[PDB]
C-alpha cells in the first residue's frame, strides 16, 4: 500500500513561517514528482505546485511563488513544504499527492495538514460526559473550550465506531471551539463508554468514561 | 491561467437515480481533465483521468465525457456512499486548476429523528458554565425545528446547533442543538426541555429532565 502521511495540526503566528513533511511509503520515491494543493475552509482546491525528487527541480503555480518552498530529503524518502510570511488567508488545509502517467493525475493524496494562523494562544479542551437522567440509549462527551482546531474523538480506544456521531466544532462568542460526540446503543448495561480526546496542538490527551 | 467553473455547487439526486457533474474550461483543454471524490472527512480519491478512464477500484457506475471546454462525471445509479464533493482538474497548461467543487445531497425516504436530552456533568458546573445538549440521531430530511424551554419559557438566542454531513449508509443525518447558561442561571429554574418538530414526526416530540432530580 502506497503511503503518505502529513505532520499533524499547527498554530502559527501572523509573519511567522512553518514547515510540513509527506512521509512516503510503499514506492521508489524517486520514480514519482509530488504536488502540493491547498483547501481554504469551505472551498476549492488550488495547486501550489510540483517537485521532481530525482534532481530536485521545483515548478510553482506564480500565486504561491513568494509563499512555499518544496524540498525532499531522498533517504528519508520525505517531501517538505515551507510556507514563509504567513496571514489568516493560509489558513487552510494544505494536502501533498503523487502524480502517475498512463496522463498526468494525483493518484494518491495525503490526508492533510489544518495550518490555523492567529496571535490567539494554544488552549486544551475540557471534556464533560454527556449521561441521561426508548429502545436505544445515548450517551457522549462535550468537548468545550479549545483552540485552535482540530480535536480527534475516539470511543474505547478505536473499538466503539458504530453508532458514533462527533459533531463538527462551533466557534462560540469568546472565540474559542466547542463540539460533542455522541453514541447509541439498543440498551447497554454489559460494556463501559470511554471517549478519548486529542489536541495535538496542546499535546492534551484526555479519556472520559462515561458513568452510565 | 484556465478557469474551471463547475456552476452547479449543490446537486440533491435519489438512490437508484444517474447524476450529472459539468465542468467548463474557459478554453479548450483537449480532454486533459481529472475527477476527484472529497468524502466529508477531507480524504480525496482519483476517480477518472483523461476525461473516460476509471482509476483502478473505482465503481463500473462513474464514467467520465465530453471533449475542449464542456466535460460530465455521471453516476449511473446512485448509492449511499457516493455523498461527496466531486471535483474536475486541468492539465492542459500549468497552473493546473480546479472546479470550484459539486457537493452531493441524498434523497431517501424520510425518517425521523430519535430524540435524547443531558444535563449538564458536576464537573462543568463547578467552573460557573452549564451546556444542556438536545441530540436528533438519524433523521432525514436536514430540516428540523428544535425550541427549548425552561420552565415552559420558550428560549431565544442562548443555543447554537450542529449538524453531521449525510451518513455513508443510511444517508442520514444528526444534530446537536447545546444550551449555554450561566451555573447561577441554571440554578434558578427546575425543568429543562427541547421540543422537535420534523416532517417523520405526526406531532412534536419533548424530551425533558428535573434539575435537582438529576
Known amino acids: 500500500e502506497v503511503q503518505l502521511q502529513q505532520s499533524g495540526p499547527d498554530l502559527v503566528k501572523p509573519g511567522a513561517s512553518v514547515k510540513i513533511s509527506c512521509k512516503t511509503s510503499?514506492?521508489?520515491?524517486?520514480?514519482?514528482?509530488m504536488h502540493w494543493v491547498k483547501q481554504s475552509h469551505g472551498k476549492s482546491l488550488e495547486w501550489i505546485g510540483g517537485?521532481?525528487?530525482?534532481?530536485?527541480?521545483?515548478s510553482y503555480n506564480q500565486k504561491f511563488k513568494d509563499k512555499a518552498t518544496m524540498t525532499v530529503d531522498k533517504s528519508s524518502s520525505t517531501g517538505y513544504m515551507e510556507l514563509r510570511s504567513l496571514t489568516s488567508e493560509d489558513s487552510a488545509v494544505y494536502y501533498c499527492?503523487?502524480?502517475?502517467?498512463?496522463?498526468?493525475?494525483?493518484?494518491?493524496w495525503g490526508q492533510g495538514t489544518l495550518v490555523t494562523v492567529s496571535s490567539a494562544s494554544t488552549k486544551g479542551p475540557s471534556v464533560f460526559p454527556l449521561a441521561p437522567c426508548e429502545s436505544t440509549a445515548a450517551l457522549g462527551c462535550l468537548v468545550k473550550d479549545y483552540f485552535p482546531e482540530p480535536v480527534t474523538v475516539s470511543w474505547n480506544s478505536g473499538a466503539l465506531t458504530s453508532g458514533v456521531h462527533t459533531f463538527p466544532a462551533v466557534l462560540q462568542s469568546s472565540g474559542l471551539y466547542s463540539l460533542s460526540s455522541v453514541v447509541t446503543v439498543p440498551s447497554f448495561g454489559t460494556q463501559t463508554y470511554t471517549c478519548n480526546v486529542d489536541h495535538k496542538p496542546s499535546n492534551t490527551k484526555v479519556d472520559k468514561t462515561v458513568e452510565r | 491561467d484556465i478557469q474551471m467553473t463547475q456552476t452547479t455547487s449543490s446537486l440533491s439526486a435519489s438512490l437508484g437515480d444517474r447524476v450529472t457533474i459539468t465542468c467548463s474550461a474557459s478554453?479548450?483543454?483537449?480532454?486533459?481533465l481529472n475527477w476527484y471524490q472529497q468524502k466529508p472527512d477531507g480524504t480525496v480519491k482519483l476517480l477518472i483521468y483523461?476525461?473516460?478512464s476509471l482509476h483502478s477500484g473505482v465503481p463500473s457506475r462513474f464514467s467520465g465525457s465530453g471533449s475542449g471546454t464542456d466535460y460530465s462525471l455521471t453516476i449511473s445509479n446512485l448509492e449511499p456512499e457516493d455523498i461527496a464533493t466531486y471535483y474536475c482538474?486541468?492539465?492542459?497548461?500549468?497552473?493546473?486548476?480546479f472546479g470550484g467543487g459539486t457537493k452531493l445531497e441524498i434523497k431517501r425516504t424520510v425518517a425521523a429523528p430519535s430524540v435524547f436530552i443531558f444535563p449538564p456533568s458536576d464537573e462543568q458546573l463547578k467552573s460557573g458554565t452549564a451546556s444542556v445538549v438536545c441530540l436528533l440521531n438519524n433523521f432525514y430530511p436536514r430540516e428540523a425545528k428544535v425550541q427549548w424551554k425552561v420552565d415552559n419559557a420558550l428560549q431565544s438566542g442562548n443555543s447554537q446547533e450542529s449538524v453531521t454531513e449525510q451518513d455513508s449508509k443510511d444517508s442520514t443525518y444528526s444534530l446537536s442543538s447545546t444550551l449555554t447558561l450561566s451555573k447561577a442561571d441554571y440554578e434558578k429554574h427546575k425543568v429543562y426541555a427541547c421540543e422537535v418538530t420534523h416532517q417523520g414526526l405526526s406531532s412534536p416530540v419533548t424530551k425533558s429532565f428535573n434539575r435537582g432530580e438529576c
Open positions: 499527492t503523487r502524480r502517475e502517467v498512463y496522463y498526468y493525475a494525483l493518484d494518491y
Open positions: 510503499g514506492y521508489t520515491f524517486t520514480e514519482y514528482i
Open positions: 517537485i521532481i525528487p530525482n534532481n530536485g527541480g521545483t
Open positions: 478554453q479548450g483543454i483537449n480532454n486533459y
Open positions: 483523461y476525461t473516460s
Open positions: 482538474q486541468q492539465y492542459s497548461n500549468l497552473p493546473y486548476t
